[PDB]
Design a protein around this nucleic acid. Structure first.
Ligand SMILES: Nc1ncnc2c1ncn2[C@H]1C[C@H](O)[C@@H](COP(=O)(O)OP(=O)(O)OP(=O)(O)O)O1
Ligand SMILES: [Ca+2]
Ligand SMILES: [Ca+2]
Ligand SMILES: [Ca+2]
Ligand SMILES: [Ca+2]
Length: 903
DNA sequence: TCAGTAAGCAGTCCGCG
DNA sequence: GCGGACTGCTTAC
């Protein structure tokens, strides 16, 4: 086995490293690492070290890390650049692991845990930790066991032991339905007192010390509560045993409107799953309670209990413990699906960083670039202080609001990273500047050619063409990884549609799902066998195909995220390679490329149609264009097509054989015009959109920038079994829109696009009539809630108070005194409902924590005073009016001359 | 919410004879 | 009532 690190820390003049040795065993060492840094030197001094600009450097070896940091300070005092990696543990990792790391996850101890704390006087604050810890469940990935630490005796109640037999039973048997697959993996340990529980947990922790520590809200709650509770009972030295190096630090996390404290456990990598989910899932959720997310991700029923959580242990300890175990398992199920831990390990080891730094693309890229340059004996520049400055971004075309029947879209592959590679944009490849003409002059190819020597961007920057910069070199490696995983994702998607087709004709037989790799397109043999399978086997295969697609999606989208964040990092003042000349070089080239190709596509289609000045490109955003295909369809005539799939095939062929070669020609010319290093502007067909053949559907519509809906038959080569709505920007896509309203608006859109005006009017009329029956949660609006304190004036709204904040203040007056009542947390999300005039709450709206039922203290009065009319007009009718006006249809039947006859 | 720009809509405040 | 200046929040890239 090749060795690999687990964790690394700097403590004073020592590096503390946990690692897997050449034998597969976990080991720990303390190393008195001697760091090197660099200063510029005369050319007359012989050296093998050069900075990124080719200037010679001398290496300075320090006796210890504190000497190195002190030298940095003195160099600042003098006014001279101190070069090299100033994060010494990253230098250590680079020296110790000077090869591509291959890690073995089975050797990495991944721990996920959850704690329960009974509290009669509200939320148990981790900084205080004044209440006993009465349950801990800790899952260990190496043992594959759930360790349950259960407190039987508390000042808040003495209880009986948890029963595994009752836990295993159906909820309908009075059981807790702990999944059968984990029952045999539970190791249950009851305790007669809290001191005993905590002492044993720490000894356990010592034996099975987590490398990766995760769970749900562990960084903000579980870890600081456990640390502070042990501190309060035993003293700080005992609490520090949670760190394998016995070092901890209270870290203050600053935000815009306040701050919070977490505990840094040296020698542990905390990856809170809530944070992994928020950053890598590409969702925005109305609520981030584990119950809400588990329902969303896994389609598992809410964990139900009677009464408040503060009385659960006393009333039903059996269920209390079971639900603590289930909560731990749910995080493992989410990870089995989403694979964010796998993602973190992959990226972490690739970059050679602490695993927890995967949350920071700046730290990630700093390490990738440093390791890359080190291999060439090159020396990285010092980080400098820069003032924050705004800079321009992408171009977005103003569309003419309208219905659009037939649409084909085209999109540039990994645009910003492709621009970096094409132009050769890097700190060390800057060659100079040229005199800029207005952007429209480059778009229309009338400006003089920027350079005959260097590779250019329309912002005025020129770059060397003789060799690739380190940024293009390293961004390419990650792009190639992304491409591989996207390939797997798309194959699983295509395979999924094959199964969906086969499910139209399932066989009446008893059989098994096929043993296949869903990352690769199904062969003819697999397809034949699929056509003979039962619905039960097909559905299992569909589930597996969809799980493979999700795994591919995680892997690809987050590598895309990483490479796009490098382009972004060039515009962040804390990045070592911050440079607005390079950041703007990317964004400005992107603006040009889009408007250039818009002109080229318009010119090409006007030619094939024999017209002049006709606008075929109806819309574009950053790197995509949407092309009206109405004229193309009309050139053969709708009557000539056998079915929907026939015109879809026809447009697919037109895009691939006619438009893409024309687009490629346009970009090759643009590359030559800018004298770029390498043509990498690859714009491929994305969506084919239109109404069902022979229907009154409108196909698609735009209301304005970033606001449109399309009925899509084929997306990136995936031919759907059923048409899919592609809706961007509209209220159906916003987490702030009520759940039931999202659903109804989506059905309104489906009907508009697929069925037409009459169908739309039929559905609107019904929804307007029945909506008052919808559950209050399903019709509540959602909002994040920041700066609640600023707008609180004696419990009443101050000047310019936001509507959702007003609702919170209303709530806070209505629950006044009740220390048990759920408190709205600053920066979290709330449900919001409008209230009718003259209500007992004394205001026009009320808000409460999202993902929860409103407290029974005030639930009946809210339901009685809920303003359904205002709710309907604001969340449903107003957006729908927006859609229908843009698409030139009516949601209510207009009166005609036929209303004058028989009955 | 510790960890790039563009741009939409809700709502406040208040003008607009 | 609509719209402009503004805050707040949320998407699309
Ligand atoms: N989350 C983001 N952070 C920073 N920049 C972004 C982000 N999303 C998009 N961009 C910028 C960089 C992208 O290259 C550009 C176009 O976005 P988009 O078309 O969604 O992805 P892409 O072109 O990078 O990859 P794809 O190959 O999937 O189309 O907009
Ligand atoms: Ca398990
Ligand atoms: Ca793209
Ligand atoms: Ca069949
Ligand atoms: Ca795009």
């Amino acid at each position: 086995m090749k060795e690999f690190y687990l964790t690394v820390e700097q403590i004073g003049d020592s590096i503390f490293e946990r690692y897997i040795d050449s034998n597969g065993r976990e080991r720990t060492r303390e190393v008195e690492y001697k760091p090197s840094l660099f200063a510029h030197c005369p050319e007359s001094q012989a050296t093998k070290y050069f900075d990124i600009y080719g200037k010679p450097c001398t290496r300075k070896l320090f006796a210890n890390m504190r000497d190195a940091s002190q030298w940095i300070k003195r160099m600042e005092d003098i006014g001279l650049e101190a070069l090299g990696m100033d994060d010494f543990k990253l230098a250590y990792l680079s020296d110790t692991y000077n090869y591509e790391i291959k890690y073995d996850h089975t050797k990495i101890r991944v721990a996920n845990f959850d704690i329960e704390v009974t509290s009669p006087d509200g939320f148990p604050e981790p900084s205080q930790a004044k209440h006993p810890i009465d349950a801990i469940t800790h899952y260990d990935s190496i043992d594959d066991r759930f360790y349950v630490f259960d407190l039987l005796n508390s000042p808040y109640g003495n209880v009986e032991e948890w029963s595994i037999e009752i836990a295993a039973k159906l909820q309908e048997q009075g059981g807790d339905e702990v999944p059968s697959e984990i029952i045999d993996k539970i190791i249950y340990m009851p305790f007669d007192n809290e001191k005993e529980l905590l002492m044993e947990y720490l000894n356990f922790w010592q034996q099975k010390t987590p490398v990766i520590l995760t769970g749900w809200n562990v960084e903000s709650f579980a870890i600081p509560y456990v640390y502070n509770r042990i501190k309060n009972i035993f003293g700080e030295s005992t609490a520090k045993r949670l760190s394998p190096h016995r070092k901890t630090r209270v870290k203050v996390i600053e935000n815009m409107y306040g701050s919070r404290e977490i505990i840094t456990l040296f020698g542990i990598s905390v990856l809170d799953y809530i944070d992994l989910y928020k950053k890598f899932s590409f969702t925005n959720q109305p609520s981030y309670s584990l119950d809400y997310i588990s329902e969303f991700e896994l389609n598992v029923g809410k964990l139900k209990y009677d009464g408040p959580i503060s009385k659960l242990r006393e009333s039903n300890h059996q269920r209390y413990i079971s639900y603590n175990i289930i909560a731990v398992y749910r995080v493992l199920q989410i990870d089995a699906k989403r694979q964010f831990i796998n993602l973190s390990l992959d990226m972490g080891y690739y970059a050679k960083i602490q695993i927890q730094s995967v949350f920071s693309p700046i730290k990630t890229w700093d390490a990738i670039i440093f390791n890359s340059l080190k291999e060439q004996n090159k020396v990285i520049p010092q980080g400098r202080s820069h003032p924050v400055q705004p800079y321009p971004g992408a171009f977005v075309k103003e569309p003419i609001p309208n219905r659009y029947k037939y649409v084909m879209s085209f999109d540039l592959t990994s645009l910003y990273p492709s621009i970096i590679r094409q132009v050769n944009i890097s700190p060390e490849t800057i060659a100079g500047t040229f005199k800029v003409a207005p952007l429209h002059d480059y778009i229309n190819a009338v400006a003089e050619r920027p350079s005959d020597v260097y590779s250019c961007s329309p912002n005025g920057m020129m770059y060397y063409k003789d060799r690739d910069g380190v940024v293009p070199t390293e961004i390419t490696k990650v792009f190639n990884q992304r491409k591989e995983h996207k390939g797997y994702m798309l194959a699983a998607q295509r395979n999924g549609e094959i199964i969906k087709e086969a499910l139209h004709n399932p066989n009446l037989s008893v059989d098994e799902p096929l043993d296949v790799d869903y990352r690769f397109d199904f062969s003819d043999e697999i397809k034949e066998k699929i056509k003979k399978l039962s619905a039960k086997s097909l559905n299992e295969m569909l589930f597996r195909a969809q799980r493979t697609e999700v795994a591919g999606m995680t892997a690809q989208i987050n590598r895309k995220l990483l490479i796009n964040s490098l382009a972004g990092a060039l515009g962040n003042v804390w990045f070592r390679y911050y440079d607005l000349r390079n950041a703007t070089a990317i964004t400005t080239f992107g603006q040009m490329a889009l408007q250039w190709i818009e002109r080229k596509v318009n010119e090409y289609l006007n030619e094939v149609c024999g017209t002049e000045g006709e606008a075929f490109v109806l819309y574009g955003d950053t790197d995509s264009i949407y092309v009206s295909a109405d004229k193309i369809i009309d050139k053969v005539g709708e009557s000539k097509f056998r079915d929907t799939n026939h015109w879809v095939d026809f447009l697919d062929k037109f895009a691939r054989e006619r438009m893409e070669p024309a687009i490629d020609r346009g970009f090759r010319e643009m590359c030559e015009y800018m004298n770029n290093k390498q043509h990498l502007m690859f714009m491929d067909r994305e969506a084919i959109a239109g109404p069902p053949l022979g229907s009154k559907g409108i196909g698609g519509f735009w209301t304005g920038k970033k606001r449109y809906a399309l009925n899509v038959w084929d997306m990136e080569g995936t031919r759907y079994a059923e048409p899919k709505l592609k809706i961007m920007g509209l209220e159906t896509q916003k987490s702030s829109t009520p759940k039931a309203v999202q659903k109804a608006l989506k059905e309104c859109i489906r009907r508009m696009l697929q069925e037409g005006e009459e169908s739309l009017q039929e559905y609107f009329k019904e929804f307007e009539k029945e909506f008052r029956q919808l559950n209050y949660i399903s019709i509540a609006s959602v909002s994040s809630a920041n700066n609640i304190a600023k707008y609180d004036v004696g419990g009443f709204p101050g000047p310019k108070c936001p509507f959702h904040i007003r609702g919170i203040l209303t709530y806070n007056r209505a629950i006044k005194g009740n220390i048990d009542a759920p408190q709205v947390v600053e920066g979290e999300k709330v449900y919001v409902l409008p209230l009718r005039e003259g209500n007992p709450f004394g205001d026009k709206c009320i808000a409460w924590p999202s993902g929860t039922e409103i407290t029974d203290l005030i639930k009946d009065d809210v339901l009685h005073w809920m303003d359904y009319t205002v709710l309907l007009e604001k969340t449903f009718i107003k957006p729908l009016e927006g859609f229908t006006s843009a698409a030139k249809l009516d949601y209510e039947k207009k009166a005609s001359l036929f209303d004058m006859f028989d009955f």
